[PDB]
């Protein structure tokens, strides 16, 4: 099973980073710090689920497809709360027909990233809509209640060693988890839409406590009012994934480039790029453009 980029027809670094405006401009446009629903959070999020049903044992899933358009994974319990990603995409997709959705999906997270003041993500246009069929079953995105063993072989699949399974949970200090689309409550960390290490070092320097929450489900809180999921409480668990959280506690800038690489490999498993294919694209935000 073989998915070969394939460039929109005529499109070029400019029009995707007309699309990267779109969404940048809408994101301010949408996203306040104080908002129940983060849209720049949804976006990266969205663009982590399409990619995340990838398996690398038979290349199904992945964000190549665009499938999230499609009901059955529209609908994955997992994916709860994602669709207010989607609602704030179909303007944009609107204005911009001719981009594929697993384009504009994976875009929306790199330009949401972007936006929040995270690292340069390169980009790599080329994903082809696949037909319903090709819809991934649900069960392929991680549950939260498990443990530094199952995080870490849930990644194999999406061939993710230890450090990039560490350097992508960090995209957690984004936003919050919401007690009705997860059955988890709270923030990670400074829930502000800013993109910063912040979820290693209150992983580290805060103090934690296995509580319940309203839904029944454990989780670690702190003091100060965040929260952790136990998945997210393995990384300081589990020695291996520990000793990458304390890196990329003291290191903002291995963290962004690390995260940036992870993400960008998440973005395109799956996807056969030939050998003519353009480069990455790194898209310049909206404040370096000085819009
Ligand atoms: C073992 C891995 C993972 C699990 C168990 C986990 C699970 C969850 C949970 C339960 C939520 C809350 C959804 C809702 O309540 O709104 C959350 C949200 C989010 N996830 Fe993860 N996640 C994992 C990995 C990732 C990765 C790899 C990234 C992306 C690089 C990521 C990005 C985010 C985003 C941006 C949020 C915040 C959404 C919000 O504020 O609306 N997650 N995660
Ligand atoms: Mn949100």
Known sequence: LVHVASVEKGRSYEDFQKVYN??????????????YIGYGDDLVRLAWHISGTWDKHDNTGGSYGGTY???????????????????????????????????????????????????????????VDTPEDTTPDNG?????????????TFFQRLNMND????????????????????GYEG????????????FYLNLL????????????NEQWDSKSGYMMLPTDYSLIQDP????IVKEYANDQDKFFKDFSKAFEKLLENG???????????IFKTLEEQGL
């Open 205 to 216: 320097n805060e103090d934690w406590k296995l509580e319940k929450n309203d839904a029944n």
């Open 187 to 198: 923030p990670w960390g400074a829930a502000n839409n800013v993109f910063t290490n912040e």
């Open 69 to 127: 358009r499609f009901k059955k994974e529209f609908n994955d319990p997992s994916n709860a709360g994602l669709q207010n990603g989607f609602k704030f995409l179909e303007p944009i997709h609107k204005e911009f027909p001719w981009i594929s959705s697993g384009d504009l999906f994976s875009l929306g997270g790199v330009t949401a990233v972007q936006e929040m003041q995270g690292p340069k993500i390169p980009w790599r246009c080329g994903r």
């Open 22 to 35: 779109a969404i940048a401009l809408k994101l301010r446009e949408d996203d306040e710090y104080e908002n």
């Open 271 to 281: 996807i056969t790029f030939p050998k003519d294919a353009p480069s990455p694209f």
């Open 163 to 182: 450090r990039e399974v560490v350097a992508l949970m960090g995209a957690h200090a984004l936003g919050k988890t919401h007690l009705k689309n997860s």
């Open 240 to 243: 291996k994934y520990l000793s």
């Open 140 to 152: 392929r995105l991680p549950d939260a209640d498990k443990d530094a063993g199952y995080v870490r």
